[PDB]
Amino acid sequence: MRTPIVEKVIVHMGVGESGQHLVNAEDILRNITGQEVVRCFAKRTLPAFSIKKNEPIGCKVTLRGQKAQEFLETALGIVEKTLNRSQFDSFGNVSFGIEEHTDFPGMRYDPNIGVFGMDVTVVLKRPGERICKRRIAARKIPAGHRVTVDDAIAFLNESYGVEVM
Amino acid sequence: KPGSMYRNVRQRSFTRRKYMGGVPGSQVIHYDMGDKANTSFPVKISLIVEEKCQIRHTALEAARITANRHLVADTGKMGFYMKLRVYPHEVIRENKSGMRRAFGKNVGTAARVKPMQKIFTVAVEKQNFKAAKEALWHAGQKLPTPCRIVVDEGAELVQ
Amino acid sequence: TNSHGEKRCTRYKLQKTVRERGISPVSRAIQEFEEGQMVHIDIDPSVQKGMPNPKFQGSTGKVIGQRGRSYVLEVRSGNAMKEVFSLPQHLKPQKY
Amino acid sequence: MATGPRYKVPFRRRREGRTNYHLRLKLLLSRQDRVVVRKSSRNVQIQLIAPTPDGDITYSSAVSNELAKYGYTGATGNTTAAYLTGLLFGLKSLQKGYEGGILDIGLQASSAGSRVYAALKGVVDSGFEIPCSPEVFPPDERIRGEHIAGYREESSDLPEQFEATKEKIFAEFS
Amino acid sequence: MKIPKRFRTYCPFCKTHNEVVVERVKKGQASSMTHIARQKKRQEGIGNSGKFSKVPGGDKPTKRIWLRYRCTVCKKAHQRPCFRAKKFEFKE
RNA sequence: GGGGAUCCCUCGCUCGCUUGUCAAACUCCAAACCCCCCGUCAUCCUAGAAAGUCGGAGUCCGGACUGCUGGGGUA
RNA sequence: CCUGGGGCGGGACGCCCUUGAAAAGAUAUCAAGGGCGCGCAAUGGUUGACUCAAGCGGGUCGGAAACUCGCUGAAGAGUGCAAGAGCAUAAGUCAGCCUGACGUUAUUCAGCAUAGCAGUGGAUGACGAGACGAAAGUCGGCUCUAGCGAACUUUUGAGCC
RNA sequence: GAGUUUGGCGGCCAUAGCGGUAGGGCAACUCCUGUACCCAUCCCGAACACAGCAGAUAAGCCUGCCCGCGUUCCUUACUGUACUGAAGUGUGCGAGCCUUCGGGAACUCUGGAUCGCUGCCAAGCUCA
Ligand SMILES: [K+]
Ligand SMILES: [Mg+2]
Ligand SMILES: [Zn+2]
């Protein structure tokens, strides 16, 4: 039971400024995911962004199950099944930042809205990572049960045929 | 201001600089002299004080200067290694009125050393043992305590 | 100047050792003492309720009654007999 | 992760993630026996535990495996089994002589209609005094096993056999 | 600091928790027929008046907020020991 | 981040492994004295323990030696 | 008034913490470090759910300054404000419901060791009503120790004389 | 009736921690499979919750081992050293220090051990 299944897939849009643009970004992200998105809040006021503490900045959504698989396949198609080594984490996680939301069918470009980019992260776990997430008897999984970069790329090839350059 | 003022140890330590204000910086610049990247010096002599005393940073600097001059002149620029082992951690203060609110202001730093404690260690070759001995004798003349030289390594290499 | 609070000079008296900081063993909070039993006063700093004065830290008291959760102890302080109230978290039976 | 002498390691039961010592302290201050209801994925278990300086002592113990002799063939790890185990635990504790306690669910989440509260209702309905509020109990139909209508036709016999097991378990302590 | 104008608390008279309205207490004018006023007028003559020629003292840096809690059911008020605040408002 | 368009190359702090030093208001450690309690011996005690009540006070300028590196101070 | 004469300066003139202080307690100086004369209907109570600081790696002009993912992380954070102490399935963070920041009352501590002394303050209880919670519990404010004042007088509250 | 495997609750709270290595599951636990339902997500059946036919010991868990860091205990040297209670017509110009009787470290070193011990109950089992 060492096949690195997909624990979850996360889509995040770091707009950096709240308001009408934030609502448009969250609506387009919810459309492209088919699931309610949640607003991310800043943590330190900065005159560069002119924002304050605890104020909406971006949005992200967690996808698990066949929804995650379908979104991951679409997102990998937008990069044409391509993902290089430097994308991967030290423990089997990847992420890559696309620019045009127009590449997801079912949404139309708006002159008012513009085009918002986003970053997608899929976290690769193993079958049994509930040990570090359940409430009772929660133990950290050993280092021999984690996922390596080469294991992750082999899984991606044997599961999606997403070659790694 | 003679060294006999802040010489005897009658008091507890005064070293926590976050609870004091404005300590003058120490005069002692270097603590390692000669060839610092050499460890295969066979003979190693040290200067140990034989009384419990406080040595001011200026006295330490004077002793270090005189010993370093003698060593550089006799053994050469890299014919020796010299280490000043103790740092001046104690803060010396003076009451500068009379005895009202007499808790002093910080005027310097001193090293509080114990009897038989090493102050300076010098490592040299076999042929420079007497020169190192002479240099450490001159250094001890600048210190507020009687001193004695001891051979730590290579006793059989001198006699 | 110098104060006269209860927590006067309690830096190490009311401090815990490094590996006993945190939630204390809960068995000490549900121990029962009989009348006339001799118990030590060893204050637990983490239990901030029902704590006797630190002046009685290190004293052995005799249990003379109970006042709810707490125990009433007769504790000798110099030449006086003081009535000290303590939760069992701060108490400890004397062993013979 | 003992980095050094100043590192503090938690209690062993806390390191294992099996006990909450703050909750345990709150429960021990009752000075009453705790009705300890624990559930695994395949069955449910109830204990009557009193504290000792040397360690906990158990007074009474019922497990889901005991129901199968009384005529229960359903899954031991659902609401009907939990209720039946609670009933057997309460009746057995009454037979022993112990008749009071408080509910100790430990780290288990407190959710209305849970298996833990079905076991609690089984304990209550046996006459075993234990404080509680009725709004956390499961509906009587799903204690009878109305969830059998979900996917399984074979599960459709759960209500009558639950009644039969209940009557036999009452008869054993009647 | 702010306190709600109305909140539920204990009524000492009806002996239950009811809604109570908080009202600031205004100091009244001293009666001219009290025994101290009559004594002041009686000790008034020629010369020093004793304690009646004392000038009033100073003030603390902050005074307490004198509040009165009237039950909405029995319409009786009770006043409790009160805090000491520079700025006091009612939460509405 | 200090020095004289590919930031063409020089490197102070910062983080570790060894070296050398420290702490009234630091402690992973840790005494000897001492303190509460229990037992023991010892001493006192029915020629009155411990406890209690009441009468009369003086006294609240102290000083010294031996230690505590007592604190302050050049002393 | 204190005061290394007095005065000038200052307040060691009330309260709280660390050291001095010599491992019980006590312990002085115009001894050292200082702080307080407040702030807060939430910055309070309770329950649930979570876990902090800081690093490392991944992620788009979203820069090595934002947000997000993973790993490490007994706490290196936060807990209103001094200092010290306490706290991690929390005493921290967020959310739901709330007002116990409740009326009355008894002891014992400690200001004031031993060992008398006040206004107070703080622990444990009782009575009467509640909030949260399955319950156990917790809650007499804000983790513990500062934020305050006699008699007389007036004014205010409830019922009486 | 004695022991074992597993499960639950614990006591002491690192001798138990961090790290590495090799073995097991018939029952039990677990990962694991779903989301009609009770219950849930500031989004996500991830969690919690419910209902569970399969697959699996790769994890948790258990057993064996490893001194690697951390911890705890012993041993040798330091050393009866540092410090210290009592006394002293012992001693120093002095800051001080000594002798006797009684207590007595810490660190480091030599060589070892320490990779938890343990209480109650239950259930499977292994019996004369
Ligand atoms: K004078
Ligand atoms: Mg005067
Ligand atoms: Zn009323």
PDB file of N, CA and C (backbone and C1' of nucleotides) in Angstrom, chain H residues 96-124:
ATOM      1  P     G H  96      38.663  40.116  52.949  1.00  0.00           P
ATOM      2  O5'   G H  96      39.224  38.887  52.110  1.00  0.00           O
ATOM      3  C5'   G H  96      39.513  37.642  52.723  1.00  0.00           C
ATOM      4  C4'   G H  96      40.861  37.125  52.297  1.00  0.00           C
ATOM      5  C3'   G H  96      41.142  35.665  52.612  1.00  0.00           C
ATOM      6  O3'   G H  96      40.594  34.771  51.663  1.00  0.00           O
ATOM      7  C1'   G H  96      42.935  36.959  53.377  1.00  0.00           C
ATOM      8  P     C H  97      39.851  33.437  52.154  1.00  0.00           P
ATOM      9  O5'   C H  97      41.036  32.446  52.525  1.00  0.00           O
ATOM     10  C5'   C H  97      42.208  32.394  51.732  1.00  0.00           C
ATOM     11  C4'   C H  97      43.396  31.907  52.521  1.00  0.00           C
ATOM     12  C3'   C H  97      43.250  30.563  53.206  1.00  0.00           C
ATOM     13  O3'   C H  97      43.374  29.473  52.308  1.00  0.00           O
ATOM     14  C1'   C H  97      44.279  32.098  54.678  1.00  0.00           C
ATOM     15  P     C H  98      43.212  27.962  52.821  1.00  0.00           P
ATOM     16  O5'   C H  98      44.458  27.763  53.787  1.00  0.00           O
ATOM     17  C5'   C H  98      44.736  26.511  54.378  1.00  0.00           C
ATOM     18  C4'   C H  98      45.524  26.673  55.648  1.00  0.00           C
ATOM     19  C3'   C H  98      45.231  25.638  56.715  1.00  0.00           C
ATOM     20  O3'   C H  98      45.941  24.434  56.500  1.00  0.00           O
ATOM     21  C1'   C H  98      45.194  27.791  57.681  1.00  0.00           C
ATOM     22  P     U H  99      45.150  23.052  56.340  1.00  0.00           P
ATOM     23  O5'   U H  99      45.268  22.396  57.779  1.00  0.00           O
ATOM     24  C5'   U H  99      46.494  22.439  58.490  1.00  0.00           C
ATOM     25  C4'   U H  99      46.267  22.281  59.967  1.00  0.00           C
ATOM     26  C3'   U H  99      45.210  21.267  60.359  1.00  0.00           C
ATOM     27  O3'   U H  99      45.711  19.945  60.369  1.00  0.00           O
ATOM     28  C1'   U H  99      44.869  23.268  61.560  1.00  0.00           C
ATOM     29  P     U H 100      44.773  18.721  59.936  1.00  0.00           P
ATOM     30  O5'   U H 100      43.841  18.480  61.200  1.00  0.00           O
ATOM     31  C5'   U H 100      44.388  18.221  62.481  1.00  0.00           C
ATOM     32  C4'   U H 100      43.331  18.307  63.549  1.00  0.00           C
ATOM     33  C3'   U H 100      42.039  17.562  63.263  1.00  0.00           C
ATOM     34  O3'   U H 100      42.129  16.184  63.566  1.00  0.00           O
ATOM     35  C1'   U H 100      41.545  19.735  64.044  1.00  0.00           C
ATOM     36  P     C H 101      41.470  15.090  62.599  1.00  0.00           P
ATOM     37  O5'   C H 101      39.933  15.097  62.995  1.00  0.00           O
ATOM     38  C5'   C H 101      39.509  14.603  64.254  1.00  0.00           C
ATOM     39  C4'   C H 101      38.126  15.081  64.605  1.00  0.00           C
ATOM     40  C3'   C H 101      37.035  14.820  63.584  1.00  0.00           C
ATOM     41  O3'   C H 101      36.574  13.485  63.556  1.00  0.00           O
ATOM     42  C1'   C H 101      36.853  17.026  64.340  1.00  0.00           C
ATOM     43  P     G H 102      36.216  12.805  62.147  1.00  0.00           P
ATOM     44  O5'   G H 102      34.807  13.438  61.760  1.00  0.00           O
ATOM     45  C5'   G H 102      33.753  13.475  62.705  1.00  0.00           C
ATOM     46  C4'   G H 102      32.650  14.421  62.303  1.00  0.00           C
ATOM     47  C3'   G H 102      32.039  14.216  60.931  1.00  0.00           C
ATOM     48  O3'   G H 102      31.132  13.132  60.896  1.00  0.00           O
ATOM     49  C1'   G H 102      32.373  16.524  61.325  1.00  0.00           C
ATOM     50  P     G H 103      30.906  12.313  59.536  1.00  0.00           P
ATOM     51  O5'   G H 103      29.842  13.187  58.743  1.00  0.00           O
ATOM     52  C5'   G H 103      29.943  13.343  57.339  1.00  0.00           C
ATOM     53  C4'   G H 103      29.166  14.539  56.864  1.00  0.00           C
ATOM     54  C3'   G H 103      29.071  14.703  55.358  1.00  0.00           C
ATOM     55  O3'   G H 103      28.062  13.895  54.785  1.00  0.00           O
ATOM     56  C1'   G H 103      29.705  16.750  56.310  1.00  0.00           C
ATOM     57  P     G H 104      28.408  12.897  53.581  1.00  0.00           P
ATOM     58  O5'   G H 104      28.800  13.855  52.374  1.00  0.00           O
ATOM     59  C5'   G H 104      27.952  14.915  51.962  1.00  0.00           C
ATOM     60  C4'   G H 104      28.665  15.833  51.007  1.00  0.00           C
ATOM     61  C3'   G H 104      29.512  15.139  49.956  1.00  0.00           C
ATOM     62  O3'   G H 104      28.761  14.672  48.854  1.00  0.00           O
ATOM     63  C1'   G H 104      30.791  16.824  50.974  1.00  0.00           C
ATOM     64  P     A H 105      29.393  13.584  47.864  1.00  0.00           P
ATOM     65  O5'   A H 105      30.309  14.444  46.892  1.00  0.00           O
ATOM     66  C5'   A H 105      29.879  14.763  45.581  1.00  0.00           C
ATOM     67  C4'   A H 105      29.199  16.104  45.523  1.00  0.00           C
ATOM     68  C3'   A H 105      28.941  16.639  44.125  1.00  0.00           C
ATOM     69  O3'   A H 105      27.749  16.126  43.561  1.00  0.00           O
ATOM     70  C1'   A H 105      29.946  18.322  45.436  1.00  0.00           C
ATOM     71  P     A H 106      27.777  15.422  42.124  1.00  0.00           P
ATOM     72  O5'   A H 106      27.929  16.629  41.102  1.00  0.00           O
ATOM     73  C5'   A H 106      27.010  17.710  41.087  1.00  0.00           C
ATOM     74  C4'   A H 106      27.554  18.852  40.274  1.00  0.00           C
ATOM     75  C3'   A H 106      28.219  18.460  38.965  1.00  0.00           C
ATOM     76  O3'   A H 106      27.300  18.248  37.911  1.00  0.00           O
ATOM     77  C1'   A H 106      29.633  19.923  40.142  1.00  0.00           C
ATOM     78  P     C H 107      27.547  17.071  36.852  1.00  0.00           P
ATOM     79  O5'   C H 107      28.731  17.611  35.945  1.00  0.00           O
ATOM     80  C5'   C H 107      28.630  18.865  35.293  1.00  0.00           C
ATOM     81  C4'   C H 107      29.975  19.342  34.822  1.00  0.00           C
ATOM     82  C3'   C H 107      30.770  18.355  33.990  1.00  0.00           C
ATOM     83  O3'   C H 107      30.348  18.302  32.641  1.00  0.00           O
ATOM     84  C1'   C H 107      32.169  19.284  35.636  1.00  0.00           C
ATOM     85  P     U H 108      30.179  16.885  31.907  1.00  0.00           P
ATOM     86  O5'   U H 108      31.676  16.396  31.694  1.00  0.00           O
ATOM     87  C5'   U H 108      32.561  17.140  30.871  1.00  0.00           C
ATOM     88  C4'   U H 108      34.003  16.906  31.237  1.00  0.00           C
ATOM     89  C3'   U H 108      34.516  15.489  31.052  1.00  0.00           C
ATOM     90  O3'   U H 108      34.863  15.191  29.713  1.00  0.00           O
ATOM     91  C1'   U H 108      35.154  16.270  33.176  1.00  0.00           C
ATOM     92  P     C H 109      34.435  13.786  29.065  1.00  0.00           P
ATOM     93  O5'   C H 109      35.500  12.755  29.642  1.00  0.00           O
ATOM     94  C5'   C H 109      36.888  13.006  29.511  1.00  0.00           C
ATOM     95  C4'   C H 109      37.706  12.148  30.441  1.00  0.00           C
ATOM     96  C3'   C H 109      37.521  10.647  30.315  1.00  0.00           C
ATOM     97  O3'   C H 109      38.243  10.105  29.223  1.00  0.00           O
ATOM     98  C1'   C H 109      37.556  11.268  32.600  1.00  0.00           C
ATOM     99  P     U H 110      37.641   8.886  28.370  1.00  0.00           P
ATOM    100  O5'   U H 110      38.582   7.654  28.736  1.00  0.00           O
ATOM    101  C5'   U H 110      39.205   7.564  30.009  1.00  0.00           C
ATOM    102  C4'   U H 110      39.135   6.166  30.572  1.00  0.00           C
ATOM    103  C3'   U H 110      38.093   5.244  29.959  1.00  0.00           C
ATOM    104  O3'   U H 110      38.541   4.637  28.758  1.00  0.00           O
ATOM    105  C1'   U H 110      37.980   5.114  32.320  1.00  0.00           C
ATOM    106  P     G H 111      37.488   4.038  27.703  1.00  0.00           P
ATOM    107  O5'   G H 111      36.651   2.974  28.542  1.00  0.00           O
ATOM    108  C5'   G H 111      37.252   1.755  28.951  1.00  0.00           C
ATOM    109  C4'   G H 111      36.414   1.011  29.958  1.00  0.00           C
ATOM    110  C3'   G H 111      35.041   0.564  29.495  1.00  0.00           C
ATOM    111  O3'   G H 111      35.083  -0.598  28.689  1.00  0.00           O
ATOM    112  C1'   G H 111      34.874   1.514  31.648  1.00  0.00           C
ATOM    113  P     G H 112      33.808  -1.007  27.805  1.00  0.00           P
ATOM    114  O5'   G H 112      32.694  -1.351  28.888  1.00  0.00           O
ATOM    115  C5'   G H 112      31.327  -1.052  28.653  1.00  0.00           C
ATOM    116  C4'   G H 112      30.481  -1.350  29.864  1.00  0.00           C
ATOM    117  C3'   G H 112      28.980  -1.323  29.642  1.00  0.00           C
ATOM    118  O3'   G H 112      28.491  -2.520  29.065  1.00  0.00           O
ATOM    119  C1'   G H 112      29.504  -0.098  31.589  1.00  0.00           C
ATOM    120  P     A H 113      27.396  -2.463  27.892  1.00  0.00           P
ATOM    121  O5'   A H 113      26.058  -2.031  28.640  1.00  0.00           O
ATOM    122  C5'   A H 113      25.463  -2.897  29.593  1.00  0.00           C
ATOM    123  C4'   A H 113      24.566  -2.162  30.556  1.00  0.00           C
ATOM    124  C3'   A H 113      23.290  -1.566  29.991  1.00  0.00           C
ATOM    125  O3'   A H 113      22.271  -2.527  29.778  1.00  0.00           O
ATOM    126  C1'   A H 113      24.310  -0.023  31.458  1.00  0.00           C
ATOM    127  P     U H 114      21.211  -2.321  28.593  1.00  0.00           P
ATOM    128  O5'   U H 114      20.499  -0.942  28.946  1.00  0.00           O
ATOM    129  C5'   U H 114      19.756  -0.792  30.146  1.00  0.00           C
ATOM    130  C4'   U H 114      19.129   0.575  30.233  1.00  0.00           C
ATOM    131  C3'   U H 114      18.429   1.061  28.977  1.00  0.00           C
ATOM    132  O3'   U H 114      17.126   0.523  28.841  1.00  0.00           O
ATOM    133  C1'   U H 114      19.789   2.789  29.855  1.00  0.00           C
ATOM    134  P     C H 115      16.734  -0.343  27.549  1.00  0.00           P
ATOM    135  O5'   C H 115      15.679   0.570  26.786  1.00  0.00           O
ATOM    136  C5'   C H 115      16.070   1.822  26.237  1.00  0.00           C
ATOM    137  C4'   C H 115      15.237   2.190  25.038  1.00  0.00           C
ATOM    138  C3'   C H 115      14.675   1.007  24.253  1.00  0.00           C
ATOM    139  O3'   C H 115      13.416   1.366  23.681  1.00  0.00           O
ATOM    140  C1'   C H 115      16.106   2.272  22.863  1.00  0.00           C
ATOM    141  P     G H 116      12.046   0.742  24.249  1.00  0.00           P
ATOM    142  O5'   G H 116      12.148   0.926  25.824  1.00  0.00           O
ATOM    143  C5'   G H 116      11.148   0.395  26.678  1.00  0.00           C
ATOM    144  C4'   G H 116      11.495   0.601  28.127  1.00  0.00           C
ATOM    145  C3'   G H 116      10.665  -0.189  29.120  1.00  0.00           C
ATOM    146  O3'   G H 116      11.141  -1.511  29.282  1.00  0.00           O
ATOM    147  C1'   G H 116      10.787   2.062  29.814  1.00  0.00           C
ATOM    148  P     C H 117      10.120  -2.709  29.580  1.00  0.00           P
ATOM    149  O5'   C H 117       9.723  -2.508  31.110  1.00  0.00           O
ATOM    150  C5'   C H 117      10.690  -2.643  32.141  1.00  0.00           C
ATOM    151  C4'   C H 117      10.204  -2.062  33.444  1.00  0.00           C
ATOM    152  C3'   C H 117       8.880  -2.595  33.970  1.00  0.00           C
ATOM    153  O3'   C H 117       8.999  -3.838  34.636  1.00  0.00           O
ATOM    154  C1'   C H 117       8.874  -0.245  34.094  1.00  0.00           C
ATOM    155  P     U H 118       7.778  -4.880  34.615  1.00  0.00           P
ATOM    156  O5'   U H 118       6.562  -4.074  35.251  1.00  0.00           O
ATOM    157  C5'   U H 118       6.571  -3.702  36.620  1.00  0.00           C
ATOM    158  C4'   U H 118       5.498  -2.689  36.926  1.00  0.00           C
ATOM    159  C3'   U H 118       4.061  -3.155  36.766  1.00  0.00           C
ATOM    160  O3'   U H 118       3.598  -3.919  37.862  1.00  0.00           O
ATOM    161  C1'   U H 118       4.318  -1.044  35.752  1.00  0.00           C
ATOM    162  P     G H 119       2.411  -4.980  37.662  1.00  0.00           P
ATOM    163  O5'   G H 119       1.098  -4.155  38.010  1.00  0.00           O
ATOM    164  C5'   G H 119       0.861  -3.686  39.328  1.00  0.00           C
ATOM    165  C4'   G H 119      -0.427  -2.910  39.411  1.00  0.00           C
ATOM    166  C3'   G H 119      -1.662  -3.611  38.876  1.00  0.00           C
ATOM    167  O3'   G H 119      -2.219  -4.532  39.794  1.00  0.00           O
ATOM    168  C1'   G H 119      -1.586  -1.414  38.034  1.00  0.00           C
ATOM    169  P     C H 120      -3.050  -5.794  39.258  1.00  0.00           P
ATOM    170  O5'   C H 120      -4.430  -5.165  38.780  1.00  0.00           O
ATOM    171  C5'   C H 120      -5.292  -4.518  39.704  1.00  0.00           C
ATOM    172  C4'   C H 120      -6.519  -3.973  39.023  1.00  0.00           C
ATOM    173  C3'   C H 120      -7.228  -4.927  38.080  1.00  0.00           C
ATOM    174  O3'   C H 120      -8.052  -5.866  38.744  1.00  0.00           O
ATOM    175  C1'   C H 120      -6.965  -2.853  37.014  1.00  0.00           C
ATOM    176  P     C H 121      -8.295  -7.311  38.092  1.00  0.00           P
ATOM    177  O5'   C H 121      -9.289  -7.019  36.887  1.00  0.00           O
ATOM    178  C5'   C H 121     -10.450  -6.231  37.081  1.00  0.00           C
ATOM    179  C4'   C H 121     -11.073  -5.841  35.768  1.00  0.00           C
ATOM    180  C3'   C H 121     -11.256  -6.962  34.763  1.00  0.00           C
ATOM    181  O3'   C H 121     -12.397  -7.756  35.030  1.00  0.00           O
ATOM    182  C1'   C H 121     -10.326  -5.080  33.686  1.00  0.00           C
ATOM    183  P     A H 122     -12.510  -9.237  34.423  1.00  0.00           P
ATOM    184  O5'   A H 122     -12.690  -8.996  32.863  1.00  0.00           O
ATOM    185  C5'   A H 122     -13.806  -8.279  32.362  1.00  0.00           C
ATOM    186  C4'   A H 122     -13.701  -8.081  30.874  1.00  0.00           C
ATOM    187  C3'   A H 122     -13.461  -9.338  30.061  1.00  0.00           C
ATOM    188  O3'   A H 122     -14.655 -10.059  29.825  1.00  0.00           O
ATOM    189  C1'   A H 122     -11.995  -7.626  29.337  1.00  0.00           C
ATOM    190  P     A H 123     -14.629 -11.659  29.717  1.00  0.00           P
ATOM    191  O5'   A H 123     -14.253 -11.923  28.194  1.00  0.00           O
ATOM    192  C5'   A H 123     -14.865 -11.170  27.159  1.00  0.00           C
ATOM    193  C4'   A H 123     -14.012 -11.139  25.916  1.00  0.00           C
ATOM    194  C3'   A H 123     -13.403 -12.463  25.493  1.00  0.00           C
ATOM    195  O3'   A H 123     -14.318 -13.282  24.792  1.00  0.00           O
ATOM    196  C1'   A H 123     -11.763 -10.761  25.383  1.00  0.00           C
ATOM    197  P     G H 124     -14.032 -14.853  24.631  1.00  0.00           P
ATOM    198  O5'   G H 124     -13.709 -15.019  23.083  1.00  0.00           O
ATOM    199  C5'   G H 124     -12.864 -16.063  22.626  1.00  0.00           C
ATOM    200  C4'   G H 124     -11.644 -15.515  21.931  1.00  0.00           C
ATOM    201  C3'   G H 124     -10.487 -16.490  21.769  1.00  0.00           C
ATOM    202  O3'   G H 124     -10.624 -17.286  20.607  1.00  0.00           O
ATOM    203  C1'   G H 124      -9.692 -14.425  22.626  1.00  0.00           C
TER     204        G H 124
END
